């Protein structure tokens, strides 16, 4: 026989993947990249031929690693900031709005707060949102005052999703399925290796994959199994959809003192007209994108059937709406107007109500809550939509019509939209072979 060292062998395996980020602006240890090693300046992407690998993006263990990594990174970046345990206090809170429905959704709460000297106490006021406080029996109090410990994200750090590359260690290679028509499971005609992935923006969103990867020039409807309604249907666009997300309210930040050495940033008076955030999407471009996605959906359910879009069925606010961040605070757009079309066989912009929510318990870890600080001035951001986390409603005895509704909730689907075409394989450069050679005695 004969063994060879360095034989082109890979096997499906799981391992810890480190990172690599661009050197391009520290901003006091940005959430995404603080200790991440510099990326490879020249990403050698090596192509392969006569190569066939059994890809499976739903049994992929990379997505679990990135989800746990994001959880740990969020907790770590949130740990040293200001604790907000003294905010649990009776809030003498009143309405702000004179005219009926000029804007709830803006609560002026005056309460007590211990100052630098424990002997003295100060009377302060703040502008909370309705979704952030609940009434106790008017007297209000923070919504997450009885289930967790509120912790303010220290505003020195930002919430910017920075492109991140997860690069496997030595002896582990990352396979890229470079073929165009990729379903999600099965052999990949064009398998190519690389040191590690493209720039991944770890955005947090539901029902719309903001700033995702849109390299898929086709609307490939993905899911671990089409026939299962209860499993979310992953959709990835080809043409980006522009969105104009704005927070027209001009908030001023008041640094209420919870010293020694602790600051509670409360919203001051809204200098300007009281308004509510609106998330605009061009009606046309959204129409044709829905047309493309329904044309591709008809390939998974019959030849010609009624496809109906409806608003989210129900659940938590972070699921019934569109959770995301725009410029430093979390808020939700019910997108009830983007899913209302019913299609059987075949200039303006749609506007969506958007509700601010400073206090956030994202990822549903009851052990820790969070308080997003107010951002001074008008917040404006433009994102591009590359995918839909749709869920199929249950059918019937004769399902001539199939209704698709938005879903999400589980963030793993958000991450799978960027790691569908990647997987890690360990190298086994040891391998026997039959030869005619013969070692001497």
């Amino acid at each position, epitope marked *: 026989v004969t063994v060879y060292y360095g034989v082109p062998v890979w096997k499906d395996a799981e391992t810890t993947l480190f990172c690599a980020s661009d050197a391009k602006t520290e901003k006091h240890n940005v959430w995404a990249t603080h200790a991440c090693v510099p990326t490879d300046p020249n990403p050698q992407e090596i192509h392969l031929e006569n190569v066939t690998e059994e890809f499976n993006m739903w049994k992929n263990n990379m997505v679990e690693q990135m989800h746990t990594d994001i959880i740990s990174l969020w907790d770590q970046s949130l740990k040293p900031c200001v604790k907000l345990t003294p905010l649990c206090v009776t809030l003498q809170c009143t309405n702000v709005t004179n005219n009926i429905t000029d804007d709830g959704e803006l609560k002026n709460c005056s309460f007590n707060m211990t100052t630098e000297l424990r002997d003295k106490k100060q009377k302060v006021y703040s502008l909370f949102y309705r979704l952030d406080v609940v009434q106790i029996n008017k007297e209000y109090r923070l919504i997450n005052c009885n289930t967790s410990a509120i912790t303010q994200a220290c505003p020195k750090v930002s919430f910017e999703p920075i492109p991140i590359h997860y690069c496997a260690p030595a002896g582990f290679a990352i396979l890229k399925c470079k073929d165009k028509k990729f379903n999600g499971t099965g052999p990949c005609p064009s398998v190519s290796t690389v040191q590690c992935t493209h720039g991944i923006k770890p955005v947090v969103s539901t029902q719309l994959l903001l700033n995702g990867s849109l390299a898929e020039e086709e609307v490939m409807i993905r899911s671990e199994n089409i026939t299962n309604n*209860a499993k979310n249907i992953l959709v990835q666009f080809n043409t980006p959809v522009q969105i104009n997300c704005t927070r027209p309210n001009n908030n001023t930040r008041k640094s209420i003192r919870i010293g020694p050495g602790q600051a509670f940033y409360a919203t001051g008076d809204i200098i300007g007209d009281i308004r509510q955030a609106h998330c605009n999407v061009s009606k046309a471009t959204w129409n044709e994108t829905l047309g493309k996605v329904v044309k591709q959906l008809r390939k998974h359910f019959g030849n010609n059937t009624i496809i109906r879009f409806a608003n989210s069925s*129900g659940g938590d606010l972070e*699921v019934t709406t569109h959770s995301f961040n725009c410029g430093g605070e979390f808020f939700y757009c019910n997108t009830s107007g983007l899913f209302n079309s019913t299609w059987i066989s075949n200039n303006d912009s749609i506007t969506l109500p958007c509700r601010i929510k400073q206090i956030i318990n994202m990822w*549903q870890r009851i052990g820790q809550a969070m308080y997003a600080p107010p951002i001074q001035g008008v917040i404006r951001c433009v994102s591009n939509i590359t995918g839909l986390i749709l869920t199929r409603d*249950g*059918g019937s*005895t004769n399902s001539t019509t199939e209704t698709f509704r938005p879903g*999400g*909730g589980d963030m793993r689907d958000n991450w799978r939209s960027e790691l569908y075409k990647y997987k890690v394989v360990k190298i086994e450069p040891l391998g026997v072979a039959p030869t005619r050679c013969k070692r001497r005695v």
Partner: antibody
Amino acid sequence: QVQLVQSGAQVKKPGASVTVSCTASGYTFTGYHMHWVRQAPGQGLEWMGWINPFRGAVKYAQKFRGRVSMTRDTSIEIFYMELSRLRSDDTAVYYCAREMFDSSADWSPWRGMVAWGQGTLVTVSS
Amino acid sequence: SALTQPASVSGSPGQSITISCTGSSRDVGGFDLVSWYQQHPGKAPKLMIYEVSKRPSGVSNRFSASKSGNTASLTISGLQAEDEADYYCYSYADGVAFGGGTKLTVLG
């Protein structure tokens, strides 16, 4: 242990709204789907919907969309089933059925729902 | 109901019978999630068997069930007194559907 204690029997007038609680105990609350099953006395078995406790994802039945509304409170570890626009045929006993496997299983929300509650009988009579 | 069930089956204890849960080509033969239930009179239903050609724990071996193509079947062995209840066939096809019900009589 697994016990799904529900609320007591309620009497309602057609056209009103009825809500029922179904508390869970003795298992991880945010990992198992919860099927809600309605049974009119003497006839077959039907279905309300299943709640994913993580983030509160729900999925109703075609013939109950627009009437049923299901929520939950993770902190107190109980389930809510609110039904509105009551009809004379809605007089029945309602069952909340905890599933067998974790929510991450292959066919988790469509499994056998081994655990069942005691059941609340609601009387909707003119 | 999408599932059709026999009204009732009668007999003595000791022998073996079959409960045919026939359905459609999209429910029993389409998938492999057919299950069977046991509901005592006035008591919430219990899971008497896991799935077709599959037995769970907490139940005796006496419940042997499978699917014969379009006709799922539940065969109960060692007929005894405690089996006296109503059995509901449970299949899987999109929105959950339940069988009308299979009554049975033992030693009576």
